[PDB]
Every structure is written in C-alpha cells, then in structure tokens.
Amino acid sequence: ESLSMGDLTLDPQKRLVTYKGEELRLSPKEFDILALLIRQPGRVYSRQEIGQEIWQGRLPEGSNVVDVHMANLRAKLRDLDGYGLLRTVRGVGYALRG
Amino acid sequence: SESLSMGDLTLDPQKRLVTYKGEELRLSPKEFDILALLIRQPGRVYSRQEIGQEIWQGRLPEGSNVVDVHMANLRAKLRDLDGYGLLRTVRGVGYALRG
C-alpha cells in the first residue's frame, strides 16, 4: 500500500509520490532517495549513507551526485509548496582505516 | 573463516573477538559493535546518526556523550596496541525529511 507522512504520500510499487495530492514528478533516483528518507522521518541520512543505499557506494570520491539529486528533489518539493520538508544537516561521522 | 580482516585488525562477529596485531582487545559490547559496523566497509564514513540507529536502536538522546566516550576508548585501546590513525572522526553532510 501507500505510506503517508504529513502531506506526502509515497507508493513504491506505483512509483507514485504526491504532496498535498499533486504528483511529484521525480526522477527514478530522486524517487529512490525520497522513499528512503520517508521510512524514518527526521532521521538524518548522510551523503555516504544515501550513496550506499541508492547507488551501492558506486560514486567516485569528489562527486556531487548525492547533493545535486538532493537539490533537485528539494526544488520539486518547493514547486508543490512543500517548504521546509527536506533539510540539509551538517554532522559527524566515523571511519575505520587499516 | 567467519572473521573479517582489515589490515592488522581482525574481527569475528560470531565469537565477538577482535584482535589488533594479534592481541585481543578488551571492548565494551557497543565498542565491539562500533568496530563491527565500521569494518564492514573500510573507509566508509558512518555517521553518528547511523551508529545511533545501528547500535543504539535509534534512541540516543541529544546531548548524550556515550558515542564520544566509546570512540575515545576505542582510540586509546588501539593506541595501546600500536594502532594510530585507525579510527577517524570527520564532519559531513546529511539530509532529513520531515512532514
């Protein structure tokens, strides 16, 4: 079935997401990103988490792939009056080397 | 043969055993879990939020220092075994969706 969060309703099987009943015309990766973020609303997904979940980590160092898709996603949200829904949050991470 | 090896670090998820340069680390359960998460992909930066999600069930109150304290302990224990620069803390960017 569809999952609703605020005025967003997302149906992964139909590849259909609406904001206040109007279809968000997302690219496939934009849709995949939004379907990830809606699963735990307010959870901050880091760039590399989104890169891992949505691209299997197959993004080269120094690419802007995640950010450019996030920026396009937010624009599409704002176009349907979905202001303040997608946030960019600076944060902290940890990595193991060997 | 269930264990993971990254450089001089070997982590066995079944035995919950970690050695560095052959010597067993004495770790708290969540310190072991941190290493078992981070070793899954050497160099992958795991955010504090996903460490919270993966290891604290997503229920770390804002202002808790427990991740910080465990990271400091991990660094100290690696340094004790001649392990420097293994655990990196780096700032980054994330995205969150609210309704």
Residue A16 belongs to domain with CATH number = 1.10.10.10
Count of domains forming chain B: 1
Q: Confirm if B81 and B21 have CB atoms less than 8 A apart.
A: yes
Domain encompassing residue A32: 1-98
Provide the token pair at B88.
């990196």
C-alpha distance from A34 to closest chain B C-alpha (Å): 8
Q: Chain B: which residues have CB within 8 Å of chain A?
A: 6-9, 34-35, 38-39, 41-51, 53, 58, 71, 85-99
A16, A25, B72, B95 from A9: Cα distances, Å: 8, 13, 42, 19
Residues of A in contact with B36 (CB under 8 A): none
Angle ∠(A53,A59,A62) on CA atoms, nearest 5: 130
Q: B96 to chain A: nearest residue by CA? A: A44
Residues of B in contact with A8 (CB under 8 A): 97, 99
What length does chain B have? 99
Closest partner CB to A88 (pick from B9, B91, B95): B95
Would you call A27 helix, strand, or coil by DSSP? coil
What kind and span of H or E run contains B7?
none
Closest partner CB to A46 (pick from B42, B94, B99): B94
Residues of B in contact with A88 (CB under 8 A): 93-95
Q: What's the resolution in A?
A: 1.6
Q: Give chain A as a DSSP string.
A: --EEETTEEEETTTTEEEETTEEP---HHHHHHHHHHTTSTTPPEEHHHHHHHHHTT---TT--HHHHHHHHHHHHHHHTT-TT-EEEEEEEEEEE--
Whether A90 and B93 lie within 8 Å, measured CB to CB: yes
